[PDB]
Design an enzyme around this catalytic site. Structure first.
Site, mmCIF file in Angstrom:
data_model
loop_
_atom_site.group_PDB
_atom_site.id
_atom_site.type_symbol
_atom_site.label_atom_id
_atom_site.label_comp_id
_atom_site.label_asym_id
_atom_site.label_seq_id
_atom_site.Cartn_x
_atom_site.Cartn_y
_atom_site.Cartn_z
ATOM 1 N N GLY A 232 0.797 -1.211 0.000
ATOM 2 C CA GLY A 232 0.000 0.000 0.000
ATOM 3 C C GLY A 232 0.833 1.265 0.000
ATOM 4 O O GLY A 232 0.360 2.325 0.420
ATOM 5 N N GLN A 233 2.073 1.169 -0.468
ATOM 6 C CA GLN A 233 2.942 2.333 -0.522
ATOM 7 C C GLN A 233 2.496 3.281 -1.633
ATOM 8 O O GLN A 233 1.781 2.902 -2.565
ATOM 9 C CB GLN A 233 4.394 1.909 -0.744
ATOM 10 C CG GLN A 233 5.136 1.544 0.534
ATOM 11 C CD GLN A 233 4.936 0.095 0.937
ATOM 12 O OE1 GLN A 233 4.225 -0.656 0.269
ATOM 13 N NE2 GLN A 233 5.565 -0.305 2.036
ATOM 14 N N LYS A 234 2.936 4.536 -1.524
ATOM 15 C CA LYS A 234 2.529 5.553 -2.490
ATOM 16 C C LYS A 234 3.005 5.198 -3.894
ATOM 17 O O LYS A 234 2.236 5.273 -4.860
ATOM 18 C CB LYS A 234 3.072 6.918 -2.068
ATOM 19 C CG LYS A 234 2.426 7.479 -0.811
ATOM 20 C CD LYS A 234 2.849 8.918 -0.563
ATOM 21 C CE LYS A 234 2.207 9.478 0.695
ATOM 22 N NZ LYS A 234 2.827 8.929 1.932
#
Ligand SMILES: Nc1nc2c(ncn2[C@@H]2O[C@H](COP(=O)(O)OP(=O)(O)OP(=O)(O)O)[C@@H](O)[C@H]2O)c(=O)[nH]1
Ligand SMILES: Nc1nc2c(ncn2[C@@H]2O[C@H](COP(=O)(O)OP(=O)(O)O)[C@@H](O)[C@H]2O)c(=O)[nH]1
Ligand SMILES: [Mg+2]
Ligand SMILES: [Mg+2]
Lengths: 1133, 184, 430, 86
Positions: B69-71
């Site tokens: 769920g990282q940018k």
């Protein structure tokens, strides 16, 4: 299987790749074993899921090792490809490593691969797939590359450019690696950063390759195929708003490649596939609003859309089954995302495919398109009367085009459409078509000739019953007819058919279809099956079978078509038989069901046929057979045709069928004769009967006189026909004149100077003879009516007169056929008396029968040696009651345990000779078993002779030491030599057996005695036999026996030496050389045969004299050799 | 291809499903995936990309794809939308400041084309914390009532203790089995 | 009649088929690319019998690779000469037939025969005048036997007047360890005698015995079996690929080697025997070759010619030699070994000479015989079949797929009547 | 006689097709092809293989010619949506 059982073996094989990679001696065996172990799960690859994770870890640790040589890493790549093709790449590559650190190493491997190395292609293929797995990372390639300007001048190539170059270089190879590249195209050009920097370039290169490639060269075709595959992958795994801006340009290049006119079937499929992906790029995906309420999971428009639909419709009419399916899938996908009003415009076109019935390809394509449209629920209720109607014809498409039938694909597509209808419509808007659809699938699931169509119809019926539940008696017809019960066609046509027709909702249409289609099939087997089905279904509907179907068949029996007439006649006969059987169970006649109309037509089938000389020719043979079957059925059903010209006409036809059997195809002959005798047995037992147990004197005097006067015909076929026509006569019609018929068949089973080649006549004669013994039975004081004691001896003599019947005609031992039939006649005679008057079974006759059977149970013919053993076992074990006189019945029982008899393959020499040789211990059967063993040992087959010699050697070991045993067997064998001398059937094989026995060293105790009577008489027999011959086998066989008997000392030795010296100068130089060689061998082998130290000169003059010269030059050498050996010199007159 | 092979392939594909796990980073996706399988929780590290797992539940072959769920990873989520039968959207209850960002993220995932027909199971992870928002709070802050094209259903859980995890998968399977499955 | 279509079913059939193509290409000079590079006009005088002319003067094969699984289909396409074939000539499924004749003859085979008859009519359409067919399959494997015998029946039903020739490979317990191979073999015979016109018997036991005892091999592999099968194929078809007057076409070969409809099983032989990676510098004379070709050791079947009688014999000598010497040697062999030859078919031994010896050998010899001793190859099958069928073992695999005991009874009866006829004709006028 | 009548009917069908300019011309021509096929499939119980192959080839050629004539005389219009039919 159920689970993986070969776990330790597979683990050891996988842990052995590090010691079988250098030399290929233990490299090929390992691969073969792995392939053989993996192929067992080819149909159940799901059973490998729990083992394909640890096997991939072991395989990856070897290729990941830097110290793993090229040969070792390539071996691990072959096993990986094997596992992939076994289980599946989609399910196998998903578990492969997908981390970021695995992005640079793997790629590097792909750089150190030689595309021109066919010996390691498996390495170039799988590797590529692994790369496609490392493009599912959510990072960019620029981050992994880092700084590219680290070296002076020469800059480093990014990973994206390297992957693009690798893909562009491998989409144009011939090997299986091009395909892998297509996987990378759907994993690399579809990425977010790669698409932004490698989409315009990759699409300009593909267009250029499509524009400058020909489908007439080998390379250009490969490049076009690769480009089409890449474009299809891009349009499938790619976005719609990134790929839509290019779909018009691509469509144009595809249309310019003029593929629909290429003879490359795979290019056309790729073009069609690329045409449906481009088309689906012009329209947004829609979702079935009709879900969540019709069944569970288990149990604006661009202008290019018109061109895409036109191309798909054109492709629907392709000749290949692969392009048709692809176009149908494309049409279905296109219609699955179109308005509710415009979609119908496509259906109206599909119907146009059903314009011409001769175009099976168009019908198949239309059915596939309809199924694809119905599977997604895109067909409106208004199109039910037009579509379903067509489907009712597609389920019965079976046309002939000469010698190859058609319609298997049409009916298969009709079942898929019916299956899709389960979810295409709702239960309320399909009500007025449930009955028609259900009965249609019912007729296809029980009455199709192809198992695939039957299974498809069964699956469609199950789907309709599970998803709609509106089919009458769905559970019943679904539990009885399933994937297993429907497999059998006989069951579907006779058992399941009656169960399904038991209900009133499937009695009329099933019988109608059976009468208007299956009965008029183009195959006799299908016609007979339909007739049997109608017969079985004639007891669930007597009124309908006697009032609407019977008259329906009476009008078709007169049609011009031959097959139709035959089928109608069979159906009428079956209906009559069923009605008679039904009336018999109600103490009522058959005329009640068969009205006067039926009785008239049935009394006009045989008469009308003869009026149009329809009984002539090959086509007339089938009408003759049908009329015979009809007459048999009518006579068995007891019809009121007594005293009419129809009986006279039937008699005539039966008589003509047998008087002209030589005019019948040998292939379909034995059948037409067993079909005319059977019909004669029913007609003469229902109509030739004036009172209970009697018959018309006039009818009994004309038949017998006519048949007994035809057993002496000059034609053999007529003789056989009349012989069987005399063995089917009723007992009421043989009473009073049985001795005449007996004397007649006896002459029919005899062999005169003129009837030497009439082997088939004796067969049917013996068959008929025993047949009349079993009809009349046994009776005390009744020679003219039954088997008494006044006629029992003559029958036995006639039966045992055919045993000595060996006929070596152009074909071979045709006599085996006559010697077989006799073996049956006794098997039915001695048994019959054993069940009534066993006292008539004489002792000497029974012993002779048992001896002949034992003799025949040891011939060189496996087929007839298996029948003789079976007959012997059937006449020895018989204990119901047992046989009165069987020589050694206790020893025979101990040697042939009834328990261990049913599991003995008498047809195989290995499991037949070792057991039959044990009968020599019985003095009664000793001679008859030794004769058989002798005639079987001198044959020509290797296995037979080997098994005979092995059994003989294993048996003579227990009697060689015993003198009296070797003094009884030797005498028996010498009596067989005096019994069969100049016969030319036992003489040749008896000499070879003697030579083999002498070479093995069996008669050694007698060699010590001088001038033993055995050899004394054997020498005279050999002199009488070999003297005056021609064939070389007999001469060679005689020279062998002589040089083997020379061992015996005494005057016999001198006589044998003289005979050998005489044979040395035979008329043929080959015989002379053979005799010289055998003399030299027997001289250098034995000892004390030549004295006075004159053996040296003898051997020298034997080795120096050229036996291939003239006779005047060799006579002097022969005289010199005789003088040196002390042998009188023969004279020359 | 005949009807028998077509039915066999359809049955084989019916026994396979896809459950894409999405959500903001530091939410507890890897923890939930490890607790549902029975692995150890004390040795879990943030995904530097995406992890894949396969298991069997109630006879159905479930393939879970846990994406980071990282940018810099959200832009690549599109590479995991093909053939998606279920979407497990994880939301951290303690995370109250970035909620607005977690509402925009789940809202855009619903307007996709490939993810049109696919069940939605929202797990409110980290419910046993003091400042953990309730189910109604997360349902109202993310605007779940406005959703109408997908069958959604909120349900809190806690991977640290393995609670309310089996009911979610059971409901997902029941909803997946409620609709018809057709090949393409 | 000047174009022959090639077909190959099953893994062994495809492998045997790919080896024969490579051999005839290396002998004709056709490199893997497809261009001619030999050194003799005779190589091009009869090139249209198996190849097709295409743009650029290319020679495209005329074969059709058929299977029910993808393994063998990928193995041949990736081979050294794999590129030679047509990409649309490979027709296969995904599941196989699992060593079951029923699965390969009534289900997967019955479904893929449609596509198979599509490429077949594609090759027959590009043939001025079709001459016949040459299928390469095995009688042991399920897919190789069932679907391949299903293609023979379909061709005989479609094409009325066309010769049918096959290269049946009889299995052997020494090579494979599968129990249902006796059943998969017997049934096949029941079809051949009633479908195929010519059929060569290549027993696996004979190859194993020749590789383990003669060539001295501790572990003979399938690579050694294909090395003996391809040489035999190249030797028996040397007359159809080069000029000749004896057997130039298939119809003449059939008329000369098929004395009876049901009796057409020919045991082939080739000499001198060689193996992979072996060069024999010694050139055997013509008498030595004639004496070795007739030896039972050089026979591809497990039958001794001496224990039988010949019906039709055809010998071919490839290599630079004299015709008078070959004729004299053949006459001497016929005179000396006259007892092993039926005297009721006069002139039943034919001899031919060719000026194109195989590769790696200066002198070669071939033998296509029709002796009645071939019956021994079936008797062995009979024992196994009967022993396994009497107790009902592994029968549910067949009865559960539409078959029944009637078919096994029928096939057993047909095979048994074929043995009796052979035995009778062997003892004609005894 | 069978070969004679087959050749006669084939020549008649060819002459009728060479002058086919109506659907009734082509429809009658497509009922002589059905009759011929029915006759041939009912005579394969006594005919040779070469004659059967020749008949099959002739039937295939006649069917191809009939299909070409139907495609030429009746050019099927391209696909088009029913939007705004009037
Ligand atoms: N000589 C030889 N025999 C082979 C070869 N491959 C298989 N066999 C034999 O063929 C039989 C097995 O048949 P396969 O060819 O494997 O069968 P298939 O045609 O692939 O059929 P399925 O396995 O049922 O899909 C056994 O008797 C093997 O020993 C080969 O390359 N050479
Ligand atoms: N208190 C608490 N912490 C949790 C829970 N579930 C996960 N975590 C922790 O939250 C951190 C982030 O978890 P991780 O699996 O890396 O989430 P992801 O990487 O975003 O998918 C980890 O340290 C987990 O141990 C929970 O139910 N309660
Ligand atoms: Mg994580
Ligand atoms: Mg196989």
């Amino acid at each position: 299987l159920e689970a993986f059982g070969e776990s330790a073996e597979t683990r050891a094989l996988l842990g052995r790749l590090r010691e079988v990679h250098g030399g290929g001696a233990e490299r090929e065996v390992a691969l073969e074993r792995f392939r053989v172990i993996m192929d067992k799960y080819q149909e159940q690859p799901h059973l490998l899921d729990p083992h394909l994770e640890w096997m991939m870890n072991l395989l990856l640790d070897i290729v990941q090792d830097q110290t793993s040589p090229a040969s070792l890493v390539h071996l691990a790549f072959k096993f990986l490809y094997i596992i992939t093709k076994v289980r599946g790449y989609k399910t196998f590559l998903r578990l492969f490593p997908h981390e970021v650190a695995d992005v640079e190493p793997v790629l590097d491997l792909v750089t150190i691969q030689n595309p021109k190395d066919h010996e390691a292609w498996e390495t170039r293929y799988m590797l590529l797939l692994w790369l496609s797995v490392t493009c599912l990372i959510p990072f960019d390639f620029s981050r992994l590359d880092g700084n590219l300007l680290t070296q002076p001048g020469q800059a480093r190539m990014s990973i994206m450019d390297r992957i693009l170059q690798i893909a562009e270089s491998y989409l144009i190879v011939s090997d299986k690696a091009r395909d892998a590249a297509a996987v990378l195209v759907s994993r690399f050009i579809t990425r977010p950063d790669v698409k932004q920097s490698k989409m315009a370039e990759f699409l300009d290169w593909s267009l250029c390759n499509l524009a400058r490639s020909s489908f007439q060269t080998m390379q250009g075709v490969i490049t076009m195929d690769g480009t089409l595959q890449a474009l299809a992958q891009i349009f499938k795994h790619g976005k719609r708003e990134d790929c839509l801006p290019y779909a018009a340009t691509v469509l144009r290049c595809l249309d310019g490649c003029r593929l629909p006119e290429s003879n490359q079937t795979l290019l056309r499929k790729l073009g069609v596939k690329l045409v449906q992906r481009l088309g689906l790029t012009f329209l947004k995906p829609k979702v079935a609003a009709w879900r969540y309420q019709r069944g569970c999971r288990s149990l604006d428009v661009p202008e290019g859309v018109e061109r895409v639909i036109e191309q798909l419709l054109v492709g629907l009419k392709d000749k290949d089954t692969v392009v048709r399916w692809s176009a149908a899938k494309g049409i279905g996908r296109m219609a699955g995302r179109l308005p509710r009003a415009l979609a119908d415009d496509v259906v109206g076109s599909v119907l146009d495919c059903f314009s011409f019935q001769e175009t099976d390809k168009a019908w198949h394509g239309g059915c596939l398109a309809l199924a694809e449209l119905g599977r997604r629920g895109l067909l409106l209720p208004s199109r039910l009367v037009d579509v379903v109607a067509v489907i009712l014809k597609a389920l019965t498409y079976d046309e002939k085009r000469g010698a190859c039938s058609v319609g298997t694909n049409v009916r298969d597509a009709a079942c898929y459409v019916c299956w899709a209808f389960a979810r295409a419509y709702e239960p309320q808007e399909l009500k007025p078509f449930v009955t028609a659809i259900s009965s249609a699938l019912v007729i296809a699931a029980v009455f199709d000739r192809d198992i695939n169509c039957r299974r498809a119809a069964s699956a469609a019926f199950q789907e309709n019953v599970g998803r709609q539940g509106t089919f009458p008696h769905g559970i019943d017809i679904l539990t009885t007819a399933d994937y297993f019960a429907v497999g059998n066609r006989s069951n579907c046509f006779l058992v399941i058919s009656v169960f399904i027709a038991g209900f009133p909702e499937y009695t009329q249409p099933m019988i109608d279809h059976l009468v208007t289609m299956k009965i008029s099939h183009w195959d006799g087997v299908i016609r007979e099956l339909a007739a049997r089905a109608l017969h079985n279904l004639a007891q669930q509907a007597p009124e309908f079978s006697a009032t609407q179907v019977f008259p329906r068949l009476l009008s078709m029996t007169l049609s011009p078509d031959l097959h139709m007439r035959h089928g109608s006649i069979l159906a009428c006969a079956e209906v009559a038989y069923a009605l008679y059987k039904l009336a018999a169970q109600e103490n009522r006649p058959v005329t009640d069901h068969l009205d006067e109309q039926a009785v008239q037509g049935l009394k006009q089938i045989h008469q009308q046929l003869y009026d149009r000389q329809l009984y002539r020719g090959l086509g007339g043979q089938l009408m003759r057979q049908a009329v015979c079957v009809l007459i048999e059925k009518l006579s068995l059903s007891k019809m009121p045709f007594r005293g009419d010209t129809v009986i006279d006409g039937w008699q005539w036809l039966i008589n003509d069928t047998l008087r002209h059997l030589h005019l019948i195809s040998s292939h379909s002959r034995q059948q037409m004769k067993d079909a005319a005798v059977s019909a004669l047995a029913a007609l003469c037992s229902e109509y030739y009967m004036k009172e209970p147990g009697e018959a018309d004197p006039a009818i009994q005097e004309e038949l017998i006189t006519q048949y007994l006067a035809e057993l002496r015909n000059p034609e053999e076929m007529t003789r056989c026909g009349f012989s069987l026509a005399l063995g089917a006569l009723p007992g009421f019609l043989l009473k009073g004149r049985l001795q005449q018929v007996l004397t007649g068949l006896r002459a029919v089973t005899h062999t005169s100077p003129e009837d030497v080649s009439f082997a088939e006549s004796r067969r049917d004669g013996l068959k008929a003879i025993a047949r009349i013994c079993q009809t009349v039975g046994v009776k005390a004081g009744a020679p003219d009516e039954a088997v008494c004691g006044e006629n029992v001896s003559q029958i036995y003599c006639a039966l045992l007169g055919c045993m000595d019947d060996y006929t070596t005609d152009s074909r071979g031992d045709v006599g085996t056929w006559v010697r077989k039939a006799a073996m049956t006649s006794l098997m039915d005679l001695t048994l019959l008396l054993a069940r009534s008057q066993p006292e008539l079974i004489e002792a000497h006759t029974c012993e002779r029968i048992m001896c002949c059977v034992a003799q025949q149970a040891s011939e060189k013919i496996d087929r007839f040696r298996a029948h003789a053993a079976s007959v012997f076992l059937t006449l020895l074990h018989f204990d119901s009651p047992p046989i009165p006189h069987v020589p050694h019945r206790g020893e025979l029982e101990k040697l042939f345990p009834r328990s261990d008899v049913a599991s003995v393959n008498w047809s195989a020499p290995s499991q037949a000779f070792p057991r039959i040789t044990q009968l020599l211990g019985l003095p009664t059967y000793r001679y008859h078993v030794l004769l058989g063993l002798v005639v079987s040992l001198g044959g020509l087959t290797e296995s037979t002779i080997r098994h005979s010699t092995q059994s003989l050697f294993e048996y003579m070991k227990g009697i060689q030491s015993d003198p009296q045993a070797l003094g009884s067997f030797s005498g028996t064998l010498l009596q067989i030599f005096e019994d069969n001398l100049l016969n030319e059937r036992v003489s040749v094989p008896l000499l070879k057996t003697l030579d083999h026995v002498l070479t093995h060293g069996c008669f050694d105790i007698f060699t010590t005695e001088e001038d033993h009577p055995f050899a004394v008489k054997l020498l005279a027999l050999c002199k009488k036999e070999i003297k005056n011959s021609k064939d070389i086998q007999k001469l060679l066989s005689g020279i062998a026996v002589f040089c083997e008997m020379v061992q015996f000392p005494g005057d016999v030795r001198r006589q044998a030496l003289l005979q050998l010296c005489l044979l040395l100068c035979h008329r043929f130089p080959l015989i002379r050389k053979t005799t010289a060689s055998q003399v030299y061998e027997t001289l250098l082998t034995y000892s004390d045969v030549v004295g006075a130290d004159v053996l040296d000169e003898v051997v020298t003059v034997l080795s120096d004299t050229a036996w291939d010269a003239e006779l005047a030059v060799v006579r002097e050498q022969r005289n010199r050799l005789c003088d040196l050996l002390g042998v009188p010199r023969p004279q020359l007159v | 291809m005949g009807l028998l092979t077509i039915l066999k392939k359809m049955k084989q594909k019916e026994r396979e499903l896809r459950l894409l796990m999405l959500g903001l980073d530091n939410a507890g996706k890897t923890t939930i995936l490890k607790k549902f399988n029975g692995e150890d929780i004390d040795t879990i590290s943030p995904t530097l990309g995406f992890n894949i797992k396969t298991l069997e539940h109630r006879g159905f072959k479930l393939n879970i794809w846990d994406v980071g769920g990282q940018k810099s990873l959200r832009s690549y989520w599109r590479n995991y939308f093909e053939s998606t039968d279920g979407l497990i959207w994880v939301v951290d209850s303690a995370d109250r400041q970035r909620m607005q960002d977690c509402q925009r993220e789940l809202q855009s995932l619903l307007v996709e084309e490939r993810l049109a027909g696919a069940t939605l199971l929202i797990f409110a992870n980290k419910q046993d914390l003091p400042g953990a928002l309730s189910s109604n709070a997360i349902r109202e802050v993310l605007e779940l009532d406005s959703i109408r094209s997908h069958h959604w259903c909120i349900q809190g859980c806690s991977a640290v203790t393995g609670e309310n995890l089996l009911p979610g998968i059971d409901w997902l399977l029941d909803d997946i089995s409620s609709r018809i499955f057709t090949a393409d | 009649m000047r174009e022959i279509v090639h077909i190959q079913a099953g893994q062994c059939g495809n492998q045997i088929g790919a080896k024969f193509w490579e051999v005839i290409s290396d002998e004709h000079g056709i490199d893997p690319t497809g261009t001619y590079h030999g050194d003799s006009d005779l190589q091009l005088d009869r090139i249209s019998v198996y190849y097709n002319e295409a743009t650029g003067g290319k020679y495209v094969p005329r074969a059709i690779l058929v299977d029910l699984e993808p393994g063998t289909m990928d193995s041949v396409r990736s081979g050294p000469f794999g590129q030679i074939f047509r990409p649309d000539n490979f027709v296969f499924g995904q599941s196989g037939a699992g060593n079951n004749w029923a699965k390969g003859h009534y289900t997967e085979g019955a479904e893929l025969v449609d596509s198979v008859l599509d490429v077949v009519r594609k090759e027959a359409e590009s043939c001025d005048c079709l001459q016949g067919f040459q299928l390469t399959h095995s009688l042991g494997g399920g897919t190789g036997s069932g679907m391949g015998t299903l293609l023979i029946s379909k061709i005989r039903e479609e094409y009325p007047d066309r010769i049918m020739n096959t290269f049946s490979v009889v299995p052997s317990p020494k090579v494979s360890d599968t129990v249902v191979e006796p059943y998969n073999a017997t049934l096949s015979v029941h079809q051949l005698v009633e479908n195929t016109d010519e059929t060569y018997c290549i027993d696996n036991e004979a190859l194993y015995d020749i590789c383990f005892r003669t060539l001295k091999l501790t572990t003979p592999t399938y690579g050694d079996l294909n090395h003996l099968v391809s040489a035999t194929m190249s030797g028996v078809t040397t007359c159809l690929r080069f000029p000749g007057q004896l057997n130039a076409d298939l119809r003449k070969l059939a008329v000369n080697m098929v004395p009876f409809p049901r009796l057409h099983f020919f045991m082939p032989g080739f000499a001198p025997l060689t193996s992979r990676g072996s060069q024999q510098y010694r050139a055997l004379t013509v008498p030595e070759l004639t004496q070795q070709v007739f030896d039972a050791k050089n026979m591809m079947a497990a039958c001794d010619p001496r224990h039988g009688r010949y019906l039709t014999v055809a010998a071919v000598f490839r290599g630079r030699m004299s015709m008078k010497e070959v004729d004299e040697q053949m006459l001497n062999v016929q005179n000396k070994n006259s007892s092993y030859f039926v005297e009721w078919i006069p002139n039943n031994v034919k001899t031919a000479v060719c000026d194109i010896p195989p590769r790696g050998l200066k002198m070669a010899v071939t033998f296509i015989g029709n002796s009645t001793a071939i019956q021994e190859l079936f008797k062995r099958i009979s024992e196994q079949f009967t022993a396994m069928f009497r107790r009902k073992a592994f029968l549910h695999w067949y009865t559960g797929e539409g078959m029944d005991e009637m078919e096994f009874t029928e096939a057993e009866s047909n095979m048994n009547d074929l043995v009796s006829e052979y035995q009778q004709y062997q003892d004609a006028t005894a | 006689f069978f070969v004679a009548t087959f050749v006669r009917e084939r020549a008649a069908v060819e002459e009728l097709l060479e002058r086919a300019e109506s659907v009734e011309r082509l429809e009658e021509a497509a009922s002589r092809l059905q009759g011929l096929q029915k006759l041939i499939n009912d005579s394969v119980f006594f005919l040779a293989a070469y004659d059967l192959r020749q008949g099959q080839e002739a039937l295939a050629r006649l069917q191809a010619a009939l299909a070409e004539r139907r495609r030429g005389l009746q050019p099927k219009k391209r696909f088009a949506f029913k939007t705004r039919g009037k």
